[PDB]
Amino acid sequence: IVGGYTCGANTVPYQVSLNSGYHFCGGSLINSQWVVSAAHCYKSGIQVRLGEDNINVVEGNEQFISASKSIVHPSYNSNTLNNDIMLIKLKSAASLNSRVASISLPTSCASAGTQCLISGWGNTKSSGTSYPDVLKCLKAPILSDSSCKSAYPGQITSNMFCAGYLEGGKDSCQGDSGGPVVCSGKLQGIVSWGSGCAQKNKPGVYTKVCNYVSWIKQTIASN
Numbered sequence: 439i440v441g442g443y444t445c446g447a448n449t450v451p452y453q454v455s456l457n458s459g460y461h462f463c464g465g466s467l468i469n470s471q472w473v474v475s476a477a478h479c480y481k482s483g484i485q486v487r488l489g490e491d492n493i494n495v496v497e498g499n500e501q502f503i504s505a506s507k508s509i510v511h512p513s514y515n516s517n518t519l520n521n522d523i524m525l526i527k528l529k530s531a532a533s534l535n536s537r538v539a540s541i542s543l544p545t546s547c548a549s550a551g552t553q554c555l556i557s558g559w560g561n562t563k564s565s566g567t568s569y570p571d572v573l574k575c576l577k578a579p580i581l582s583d584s585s586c587k588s589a590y591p592g593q594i595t596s597n598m599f600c601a602g603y604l605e606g607g608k609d610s611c612q613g614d615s616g617g618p619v620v621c622s623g624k625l626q627g628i629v630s631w632g633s634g635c636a637q638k639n640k641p642g643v644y645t646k647v648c649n650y651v652s653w654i655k656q657t658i659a660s661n
C-alpha cells in the first residue's frame with residue numbers, strides 16, 4: 439500500500455497473509471474453512487496466516503493453517519487477468535474471534551463513489567521498494583467504469599473495477615495482490631493489478647467480487 443496508514447493490530451480481522459516461506463499475497467477469510475484471493479497468487483504449498491499484524495514477529499494472535507485445496511476460477515486468463523479469483527480451503531477450521539473473523543460477501547455490486555478499505559503488506563513506495571512489517575490500510579473510492587476504461591484502454595473487463603485516486607499518490611502495490619477491498623462491510627474487490635503503483639492516471643484494478651458470489655457459494659457447498 440502506497441500512501442496509506444498503519445491499520446492497527448488486528449483491526450482488519452479478515453485479512454490473511456499467504457505464506458510459502460515468506461509473505462507473497464493477501465487473502466480474505468470468508469468462513470472458518472475458506473479464503474478468497476487472486477488466481478494470479480496460485481501456488482502449491484500455501485500456509486494461510488490469520489491474526490497477523492507484524493508478519494515477521496509472533497505477537498500472540500496468529501493462527502497458521504495449511505491449505506488442503508486451491509481452486510482457481512474456471513475462466514481465469516493469466517494474460518488478461520480476467521477472472522482473477524481463487525478459493526483456498528484450510529486443512530482445519532480457523533478459531534473465529536474478534537481478531538480472526540470472516541468478511542461478508544456482497545449481495546449486490548457497489549457503485550462508483552462508494553468508500554472502501556484496501557489493506558496489505560505490499561510495497562509502500564511508488565518509486566523504489568520498501569516492504570512493511572505491519573499491516574497497511576488505505577481508504578479509497580471506487581472509480582467510474584468509464585474513467586477506469588479510459589485509464590486502461592482495451593484492458594478493463596466487466597469483472598474488474600478501478601478504485602483509488604487519478605491524481606496518484608495512494609494505491610495498492612506489489613505484495614498486496616489477493617487482499618481485500620471492503621466497502622460498507624462487504625468484500626467487493628480483490629487486489630488484482632495496475633501499471634506501477636500510485637502513478638497519475640493509473641489507479642489500482644480490482645476483481646469485481648459481486649460477479650462471483652454464486653460460484654463461491656456453490657464451490658464451498660460441494661468442497
Ligand SMILES: NCc1cccc(N2CCCC2)c1
Pocket residue numbers: 609610611612613614615629630631632633634635636641642643
Ligand atoms: N497499483 C495496483 C497494483 C496492485 C497490485 C500489484 C500491482 N503491480 C505489481 C507490480 C507493479 C504493479 C499494482
Ligand SMILES: [Ca+2]
Pocket residue numbers: 490491492493494495496497500
Ligand atoms: Ca505475526
